[PDB]
C-alpha cells in the first residue's frame, strides 16, 4: 500500500513512506521488501522510481 | 382518465424494480414523490 | 461445440437394477389405471376542402403493435 | 462497488426500531441466543 | 391468391370454430341413461 | 354510467359524423393522419 | 470374404416380375405374436413393480436345477427376507462399460470441389485468441423541390 | 431481498490493478499491434528468418 | 440376365392419374412438423408445428377446430390410436404426452428420455406405444403403466423413424448412421441390419396392404420385405435431393416429399417415378422455405396432406376427369449401370 | 420421502439423472436442436468430402448470420455455395420467427399486470428495441424509394 | 369436505400391519399403553442418531 | 474539444480495428490512452475506412451534386449516400463550387 | 445520435442523447428562439 503511496503529489507524503520501509525492513528482513521494490523500478513514471530508489537504500 | 390510472400503476411498478428499491427509505422516498405528484396534479378528479 | 449427444444405452447397461436406485418419484406414482377402448360561407374558407404475407415484422399485426407498445 | 447499493442505511433504521422488531412476541417452542452475549434473537432476521 | 390462382381455395384462419371443451370423439354409451 | 354519457340518437350521431367529415377533409393526410378511431365526438341537445 | 458377402443381396426381388406378392402375415399368425409378447411385457411389468419396495405399488401385479451328471438332485428355495433389511444388499449405484457384443460384422453393402468449398468464417463481433446501395433519387422528390422553389419565387416578388 | 439488484463479485480478489500497471500493458500491447507481432532477437543472443 | 433384362419391357407398369393441388390452409405460426389423420372416421386431422402447439383441422371444408397447447419446444411427431381415444405427441423439450380427446387435456406423461424425441409409434395390437430420437435408442412404453418396459439398443446415430407391425419384426427403425434395423423385442436384438441405403435415412412408411415398408435415403428410395431382409425394389429417385417424407397409398402410389419442394409420385410396384410437381411458396416467403417437411394420405387415399416449411398446410387431390389417354407418365425409360 | 433418503444412503444417488426443459435452460436447449439440425441438412447435401473440419466453420456461420439478423445488415459471403446459403436462411427466419413471436407474447403479460421476472422485463425492452428500429429503417427506405 | 368425496377402493385390503406379523421378524405381546408409548421415544431416537 | 489525431493514432486504430473488427470499439478504446469508444467510431467511418472515397471530383459528379444540393435543399446525409462519398467532403466540395461563381 | 427506450409497461419510449457540445449550441438556439418568438408574436393565443 506505501507503494501506491508513492505516486502522491505530496513530497512529505511519499518522505515519510519511504521512512516506513525501513521500518517494516528491520523488523521482517530486507528480501521480502527487496523484490517488490525491484518490482516497481519497471513501470514508466519518474516519481515511482526514484521513490523506489530511495528506499532500496533506506533498506541497505 | 383511465389512461393516466395505468401511467400511476407502472409508475409504482417502476419504483419496485428499480436499483436501490432494496434501501427502505429509497423505496419509501419515491412512493413519497409518485403520491404528491399525483394528489397535487389532479385534486378533485381523485374524489370520484 | 457439443458435436454429439449422450448415448442412452450407456446409461442402460449400467447395474444398478433394471430400474433406478429405488428412487420413487411423485411422477410415477399410479393414476388413469384404466384403458379406453373405442367402440356555407363557413365551408368555403378552407385550403384543402372538397393480404396475408408470409414475414412477421413485414406484417399487419407486427406495425399495430410497434404503433401501440411504442407511442 | 460501482454498482450495488450500501447496506448502512438498512442496518441503521433496522437498529433503530429493533426493540419493535425483534420483540419478544409470542413463544416459538425456544429461542436463540447469540454467541459470547446474552442477546435472544426472536427471528431470523440478517439485518438485525 | 394468384400464387394459385384458380381452382384453389386460400384460407386464414385464426379462429376456433369450435369451443374448448369438446369431446373431438364422442363418449360411446352403450346403454340409455335416464337418472 | 349510461344514463350521463352522450345518448346514440340517429339526429344526433348523423351529425357527429358529419362534423368530423367536414374536418379530416380539410387537412391532407400527408401531413397527419385524422382517424375517426381517435376522435370523440360530443353532441349537446334536446335529446343530450 | 466368401461366407458373409454374396451377389444375390445386391440385387432387388421385384425387378423381374412386378406383380410378385408379398403377403399379410394372417389373423392366426399374429394372434400367436400378440399372446406371447404380451405374456412377456407382464412379466416385466410385475417384476418392476414388486422392486420398487412398494407394498402400495404391487397391487398391479419349481426345482429347476439338475446337477451337471445328475448325480445328486437340486432343490432350490427361496429365503425370506427381514423387511427392515436392505433389500438386495448387493445393490448399489455404480457404472459399468460394457464390451462389445459377440455376433460379428454386417456387410455394408452399397469440379464439384470448388463447388462445395467452403470460405472461413470471419467475424466482425468476436476474434478468436489465434490467427488474429445503388438506387437514385425518385422523380417526386425532383418534382417537389422545383413547385416549392416557383410558389417561394412568386411570393417574394 | 438483496438478490433483486444482481450484481456479484468473485471471493479472493484484490481489486482493480493500478494505473502504472495498466500503463505497462498497453504499451506492451501496442508495440506488437505495430509489430505485426514479430520477435526481435537481442544483440547478444547468438543466433527462422524475420521479415 | 440381361435375357431376364430383356424381357423387362413386357411388364409396362400400371397408370395411375396425375395429383393436382386443392387447398392451401394457412394458421401456423412456424414450420408445419407433423401430421395425423383421424384412423376412424376422416372427420378431422392434426398438425404440430415449430411454435410448439398443436391445431385440428376440419378435413371437409379446412376450418380450424382448436387449438392444443402443451409443449415449450417444437412438437415434432404425433399419433392416434385406431383402439383408444388417445393422441400421442412428442416434443423437442424431452417430453411423451398422452391426450385423452374426450377432454382435449393430458392425461400421462412418460418419462426417461435423455434428450429431444423425434418419433412415436403405436402398435397395432398390445397397449405399447414406441418412441426414439437424438438418444440412439427407441423406447417401448407400457400405456397403462407409463414405464418403459424395454428398451433397444443398436443404431449409432440418432434415430429418425420408428414404425410398429403385428408380427416379427415388431418394431423397425431408421437413424442416421444409414441403417435400417428390424427387432426383435421379446429377445431385445435385432432381427436383420439392412445396410444398402448410403446416408441417413429420414423416412419410412409401411405399406398399407402388402406387407413392406419403404425407406427414403438422399437420392436413394428402397422398398422391403418386411419376412426377410430383402430388397424388393429399388425407385428412380436419382437427382431427387434429400427426401423428408414417404407416403403410401392403398392404390399402390407411394409419394416422396422433398426439400426442394418438389412432390414425386411413384408407382410401388415397379418404381417407376410417373409425377413431379413443384409447390409455389407463399408471398413473402424465401426460395429455401419451399419444402414439404410432412405427409399423410387419409383413409380413403385420394387426398394427400402436406405441411411445409412456409407455415402452410397443403392438400392435392387427384384428376378424375383425366383418364389414361391423355395423361401418360414420365416416359419409362429404365437405364443401366 | 424418508423411503428415498433411506435408499440413496446404502445404494448411491444414481448418475443417470436426466434433467428437464425449465425455463432457466430453455435458450440453451433451443441451441442445440438448432445446431444439430442444420448440420444435418447440409452433410447431406455434400456428397463425399469431410464431417470434422469443415463441421465447425459451418456453424459460425450460422452463429453470424444471426447477428447479422439481429442488427438488420445484409448477410453476404462472398464464396459461399448456394446451396449451403439456403439452408442457412431458412434457419436464420425460422429462429427470428420464434424470436419474435415471443417477444409479442411477454409484452402482453407485461400489459395486463402479470408478474413478470425483472431479468425477462429488461430482456423484452432490448428484443422490442431491435424490432422497433427495423420498422424504422424500413420506414426511411421506402420513403427514399 | 361434502362437495368433494375421496372414494376407498376395493383392491386395497394389503394392510402394512397384517403383512408385515406373516414374517418370523415380528412378534406380539401385551403391555400397557405408556410403556409402548415410552418405548417409541427411545426407538426413534435411536434411529435419527 | 481537441480531437487531435496524430499519424501514429492513426495507424494504432488501423491495426486495432483489423483485429477486433468493427463492433468492438471498447477493446479498440483500451489500445488508445487519449481516445473514447465513440471517438474511434467516428474517425474510421469518416476519414480511415480505406473503403471510402476522398479522390477528386470529375465534372460530372459535380453536375451531379449541384443537382442534389437543389433538390435537397441542405440533406447532407442524404446526399452523401447517392454520390458514395463522405458527407464532410461533399459539403466543402459544394462551397468551393459556388465560390468558383464570384467577382 | 445515441437512441434508448424507456420502460413505461404499456409502452416503450424513445429517448435521443444528443452529443454534449453540440447541446450548448442548440440549448442556446432553443432559448433564442422562443424569446424572439414571444417578443414578436410568432404564435396566436391557441397553441399549447
Ligand atoms: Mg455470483
Redesign the interface.
Given at each position: 500500500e506505501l507503494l501506491e503511496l508513492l505516486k502522491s503529489t505530496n513530497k512529505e507524503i511519499r518522505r515519510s513512506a519511504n521512512a516506513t520501509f525501513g521500518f517494516i525492513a528491520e523488523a521482517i528482513g530486507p528480501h521480502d521488501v527487496l523484490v517488490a521494490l525491484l518490482n516497481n523500478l519497471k513501470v514508466q513514471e519518474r516519481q515511482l522510481r526514484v521513490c523506489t530508489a530511495v528506499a532500496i537504500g533506506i533498506v541497505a | 382518465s383511465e389512461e393516466e390510472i395505468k401511467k400511476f400503476d407502472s409508475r409504482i411498478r417502476g419504483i419496485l424494480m428499480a436499483s436501490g428499491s432494496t434501501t427502505f427509505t429509497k423505496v419509501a422516498a419515491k412512493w413519497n414523490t409518485s403520491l404528491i405528484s399525483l394528489f397535487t396534479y389532479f385534486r378533485e378528479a381523485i374524489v370520484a | 461445440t457439443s458435436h454429439r449427444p449422450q448415448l442412452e444405452a450407456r446409461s442402460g447397461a449400467k447395474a444398478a437394477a433394471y430400474t433406478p436406485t429405488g428412487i420413487e418419484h411423485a411422477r410415477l406414482l399410479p393414476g388413469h389405471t384404466t384403458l379406453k377402448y373405442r367402440k356555407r360561407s363557413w365551408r368555403k374558407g378552407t385550403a384543402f376542402g372538397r393480404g396475408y404475407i408470409n414475414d412477421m415484422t413485414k406484417s399487419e399485426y407486427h406495425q399495430e403493435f410497434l404503433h401501440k407498445h411504442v407511442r | 462497488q460501482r454498482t450495488g447499493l450500501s447496506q448502512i442505511p438498512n442496518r441503521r433504521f433496522t437498529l433503530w426500531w429493533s426493540p419493535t422488531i425483534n420483540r419478544a412476541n409470542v413463544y416459538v417452542g425456544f429461542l436463540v441466543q447469540l454467541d459470547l452475549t446474552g442477546i435472544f434473537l426472536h427471528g431470523k432476521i440478517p439485518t438485525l | 391468391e394468384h400464387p394459385y390462382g384458380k381452382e384453389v381455395e386460400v384460407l386464414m384462419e385464426t379462429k376456433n370454430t369450435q369451443s374448448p371443451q369438446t369431446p373431438l370423439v364422442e363418449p360411446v354409451t352403450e346403454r340409455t341413461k335416464l337418472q | 354510467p349510461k344514463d350521463s354519457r352522450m345518448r346514440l340518437i340517429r339526429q344526433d350521431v348523423n351529425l357527429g359524423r358529419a362534423v368530423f367529415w367536414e374536418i379530416q377533409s380539410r387537412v391532407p393526410t400527408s401531413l397527419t393522419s385524422i382517424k375517426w378511431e381517435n376522435a370523440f365526438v360530443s353532441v349537446y341537445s334536446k335529446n343530450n | 470374404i466368401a461366407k458373409n458377402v454374396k451377389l444375390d443381396?445386391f440385387?432387388?426381388?421385384?425387378?423381374?416380375?412386378?406383380?410378385?406378392?408379398?403377403?399379410?402375415?394372417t389373423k392366426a399368425?399374429?394372434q400367436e405374436?400378440?399372446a406371447?409378447?404380451?405374456s412377456?411385457?407382464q412379466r416385466?411389468?410385475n417384476?418392476?413393480?414388486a422392486?420398487?419396495?412398494?407394498?402400495?405399488?404391487?397391487?398391479?401385479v419349481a426345482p429347476a436345477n439338475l446337477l451337471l451328471n445328475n448325480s445328486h438332485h437340486i432343490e432350490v428355495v427361496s429365503k425370506?427376507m427381514?423387511?427392515?433389511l436392505?433389500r438386495?444388499v448387493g445393490?448399489?449405484?455404480?457404472?459399468?462399460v460394457?464390451p462389445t457384443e459377440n455376433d460379428e460384422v454386417?456387410?455394408?453393402?452399397?469440379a464439384?470441389?470448388n463447388?462445395?468449398?467452403?470460405?472461413?468464417?470471419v467475424?466482425?463481433?468476436?476474434?478468436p485468441n489465434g490467427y488474429?446501395?445503388n438506387?437514385?433519387?425518385?422523380d417526386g422528390?425532383?418534382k417537389?423541390?422545383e413547385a416549392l422553389?416557383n410558389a417561394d419565387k412568386k411570393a417574394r416578388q | 431481498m438483496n438478490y433483486l439488484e444482481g450484481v456479484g463479485s468473485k471471493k479472493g480478489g484484490g481489486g482493480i490493478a493500478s494505473e502504472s500497471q495498466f500503463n505497462l500493458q498497453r504499451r506492451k500491447e501496442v508495440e506488437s499491434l505495430l509489430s505485426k507481432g514479430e520477435n526481435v532477437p537481442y544483440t547478444f543472443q547468438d543466433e527462422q528468418v524475420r521479415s | 440376365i440381361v435375357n431376364r433384362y430383356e424381357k423387362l419391357l413386357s411388364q409396362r407398369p400400371e397408370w395411375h392419374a396425375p395429383w393436382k393441388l386443392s387447398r392451401v390452409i394457412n394458421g401456423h405460426l412456424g414450420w408445419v412438423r407433423c401430421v395425423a389423420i383421424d384412423p376412424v372416421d376422416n372427420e378431422w386431422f392434426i398438425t404440430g408445428s415449430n411454435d410448439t402447439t398443436m391445431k385440428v383441422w376440419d378435413l371437409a371444408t379446412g376450418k380450424l377446430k382448436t387449438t392444443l397447447a402443451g409443449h415449450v419446444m417444437t412438437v415434432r411427431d404425433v399419433a392416434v390410436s385406431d383402439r383408444h381415444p388417445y393422441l400421442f405427441s412428442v416434443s423437442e423439450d424431452k417430453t411423451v404426452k398422452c391426450w385423452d380427446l374426450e377432454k382435449n387435456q393430458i392425461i400421462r406423461d412418460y418419462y426417461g428420455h435423455l434428450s429431444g424425441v423425434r418419433t412415436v409409434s403405436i402398435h397395432p395390437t398390445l397397449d405399447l406405444i414406441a418412441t426414439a430420437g437424438r438418444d440412439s435408442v427407441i423406447k417401448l412404453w407400457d400405456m397403462r403403466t407409463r414405464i418403459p418396459v424395454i428398451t433397444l439398443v443398436g443404431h449409432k446415430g440418432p434415430i429418425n423413424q420408428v414404425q410398429c407391425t403385428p408380427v416379427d419384426p415388431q418394431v423397425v427403425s431408421s437413424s442416421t448412421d444409414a441403417t435400417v434395423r428390424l427387432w426383435d423385442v421379446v429377445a431385445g436384438k435385432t432381427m436383420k441390419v439392412l445396410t444398402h441405403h448410403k446416408r441417413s435415412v429420414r423416412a419410412t412408411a409401411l405399406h398399407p396392404k402388402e406387407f413392406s415398408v419403404a425407406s427414403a435415403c438422399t437420392d436413394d428410395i428402397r422398398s422391403w420385405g418386411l419376412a426377410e431382409g430383402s430388397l424388393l425394389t429399388n425407385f428412380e429417385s436419382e437427382k431427387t435431393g434429400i427426401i423428408n417424407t414417404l407416403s403410401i397409398n392403398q392404390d399402390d402410389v407411394l409419394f416422396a416429399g422433398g426439400d426442394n419442394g418438389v412432390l414425386s409420385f411413384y408407382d410401388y410396384k415397379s418404381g417407376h417415378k410417373y409425377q413431379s410437381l413443384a409447390t409455389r411458396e407463399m408471398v413473402g416467403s424465401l426460395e429455401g422455405e419451399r419444402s414439404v417437411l410432412c405427409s399423410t394420405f387419409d383413409k380413403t387415399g385420394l387426398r394427400l396432406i402436406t405441411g411445409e416449411a412456409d407455415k402452410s398446410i397443403k392438400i392435392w387431390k387427384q384428376d378424375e376427369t383425366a383418364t389414361k389417354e391423355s395423361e401418360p407418365g414420365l416416359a419409362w425409360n429404365p437405364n443401366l449401370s | 420421502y424418508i423411503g428415498n433418503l433411506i435408499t440413496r444412503q446404502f445404494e448411491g444417488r444414481s448418475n443417470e439423472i436426466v434433467k428437464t426443459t425449465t425455463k432457466q435452460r430453455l435458450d440453451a436447449y433451443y441451441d442445440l436442436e438448432l445446431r444439430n439440425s442444420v448440420m444435418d441438412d447440409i452433410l447431406e447435401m455434400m456428397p463425399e468430402s469431410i464431417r470434422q473440419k469443415k463441421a465447425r466453420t459451418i456453424l459460425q456461420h450460422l452463429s453470424e448470420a444471426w447477428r447479422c439478423w439481429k442488427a438488420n445488415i445484409p448477410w453476404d459471403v462472398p464464396g459461399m455455395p448456394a446451396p449451403i446459403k439456403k439452408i442457412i436462411e431458412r434457419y436464420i427466419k425460422s429462429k427470428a420467427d420464434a424470436w419474435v413471436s415471443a417477444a409479442h407474447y411477454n409484452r402482453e403479460r407485461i400489459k395486463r399486470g402479470a408478474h413478470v421476472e425483472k431479468t425477462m422485463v429488461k430482456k423484452n425492452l432490448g428484443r422490442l428495441t431491435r424490432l422497433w428500429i427495423k420498422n424504422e429503417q424500413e420506414r426511411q427506405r421506402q420513403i427514399q424509394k | 369436505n361434502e362437495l368433494h368425496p375421496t372414494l376407498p377402493t376395493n383392491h386395497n385390503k394389503t394392510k402394512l400391519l397384517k403383512s408385515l406379523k406373516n414374517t418370523k421378524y415380528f412378534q406380539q405381546t401385551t403391555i400397557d399403553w405408556v410403556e409402548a408409548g415410552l418405548q417409541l421415544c427411545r426407538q426413534g431416537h435411536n434411529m435419527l442418531n | 474539444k481537441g480531437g487531435v489525431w496524430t499519424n501514429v493514432e492513426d495507424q494504432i486504430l488501423k491495426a486495432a480495428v483489423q483485429k477486433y473488427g468493427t463492433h468492438q470499439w471498447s477493446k479498440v478504446a483500451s489500445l488508445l490512452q487519449k481516445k473514447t469508444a465513440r471517438q474511434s467510431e467516428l474517425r474510421w467511418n469518416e476519414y480511415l475506412n480505406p473503403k471510402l472515397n476522398f479522390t477528386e471530383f470529375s465534372k460530372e459528379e459535380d453536375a451531379q451534386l449541384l443537382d442534389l444540393a437543389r433538390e435537397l435543399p441542405n440533406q447532407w446525409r442524404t446526399i452523401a449516400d447517392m454520390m458514395a462519398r463522405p458527407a464532410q467532403v461533399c459539403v466543402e466540395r459544394y462551397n468551393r463550387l459556388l465560390e468558383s461563381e464570384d467577382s | 445520435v445515441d437512441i434508448t427506450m424507456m420502460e413505461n409497461y404499456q409502452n416503450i419510449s424513445p429517448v435521443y442523447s444528443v452529443d454534449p457540445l453540440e447541446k450548448i449550441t442548440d440549448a442556446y438556439l432553443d432559448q433564442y428562439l422562443w424569446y424572439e418568438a414571444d417578443q414578436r408574436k410568432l404564435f396566436p393565443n391557441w397553441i399549447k
Open positions: - | - | - | - | - | - | 443381396d440385387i432387388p426381388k421385384r425387378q423381374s416380375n412386378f406383380e410378385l406378392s408379398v403377403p399379410l402375415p399368425e399374429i405374436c400378440t406371447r409378447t404380451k412377456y411385457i416385466l411389468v417384476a418392476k413393480l422392486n420398487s419396495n412398494n407394498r402400495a405399488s404391487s397391487r398391479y425370506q427381514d423387511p427392515l436392505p438386495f445393490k448399489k449405484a455404480r457404472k459399468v460394457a454386417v456387410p455394408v453393402l452399397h464439384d470441389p463447388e462445395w468449398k467452403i470460405p472461413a468464417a467475424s466482425n463481433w468476436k476474434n488474429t446501395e438506387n437514385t433519387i425518385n422528390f425532383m417537389l423541390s422553389e | - | - | - | - | - | -
